[PDB]
Amino acid sequence: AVKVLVPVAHDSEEIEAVSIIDTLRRAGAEVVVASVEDTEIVRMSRGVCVKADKLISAVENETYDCIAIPGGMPGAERCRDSAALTAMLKTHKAQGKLIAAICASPAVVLQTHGLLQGEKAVAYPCFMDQFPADMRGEGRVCVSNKIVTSVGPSSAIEFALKLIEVLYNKEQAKKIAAQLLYAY
Amino acid sequence: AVKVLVPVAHDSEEIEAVSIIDTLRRAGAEVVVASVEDTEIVRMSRGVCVKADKLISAVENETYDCIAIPGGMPGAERCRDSAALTAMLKTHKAQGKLIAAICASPAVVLQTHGLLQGEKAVAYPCFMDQFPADMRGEGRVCVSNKIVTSVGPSSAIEFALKLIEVLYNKEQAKKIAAQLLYAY
């Protein structure tokens, strides 16, 4: 049993959020889609309306094996500015859980809150200067110890598959790659 | 101005629906996400709850440049068994509009309703024998006159980009490919 939190906000990137959620659930994870807004329904960046499983305030004291943050702007900023999600991230980081982000959120969220110290990371290319030079990693997906980052909407499946590999193993990721028809 | 209908159902494939919707809207299309269920909110195959813009009943008499059908099972069957969507598809087909489907839906919906006559098509590989041998096309995305089909979740972005290319032009599709970071 692997448990993952995916926070969602108004103007979250919908391909990225739903790619993460769908792909992990295929692997058998319990994924909790948690709104950082004052409604369960969020209106994502291209107008897709998603009804979250929970408000983040309802799970603030829960523990997850991974917290995986979708991109989108201003979505990433709304995630950044969520006090509850910020507290959860800081606690999960110190507790050795897997912290993950895609697109803007590695810079807007992870780096703003000092969660990438000693690590490398990637992000949607325009955000790569929000990182000090020595923390700029490489790849469409970048693993750095307990940090996993990734670049954008077309890399959201690759991102989630890496998360499967890290949280389960490479054989479980390869099964889910085959389900999605991803050339692994 | 281009207008596109994307029907959604309980147990529609999330990644595929949202990939289509988000990618087309990025191109400037007006996309109408229309539930074939008796609620605007549909519970997709891996539990992602999406609140459709409209019930399909509300737009049955409308005209679209394209109708683009997400996969998922039993989602494709619920689309297949929608009377309203079936009527829309048959009318749009005769009116020379673009009919599109991904994963199961090229077989479960398009072929079931006789919409692929004289055409080639592809689908999630397990469904390729639901097509007569001479209707089996090639590619992860297959264009056949006014039919566009595609194979699965990891091909949903490629699928939608082809839809942009055919409904707009190749230069518009490349712009949207760059936004999503799809190496086109």
Automatic annotation (TrEMBL), chains A, B:
One cellular-component annotation, GO: cytoplasm
Residue positions where Cysteine sulfinic acid (-SO2H) is found in the record: 103
Domain DJ-1/PfpI: residue ranges: 3-165
Provenance organism: Toxoplasma gondii (strain ATCC 50861 / VEG)
BP terms from Gene Ontology: glyoxal metabolic process
Protein name (database record): DJ-1 family protein
UniProt keyword annotations, A-Z: Repeat, Signal
Domain of life: Eukaryota
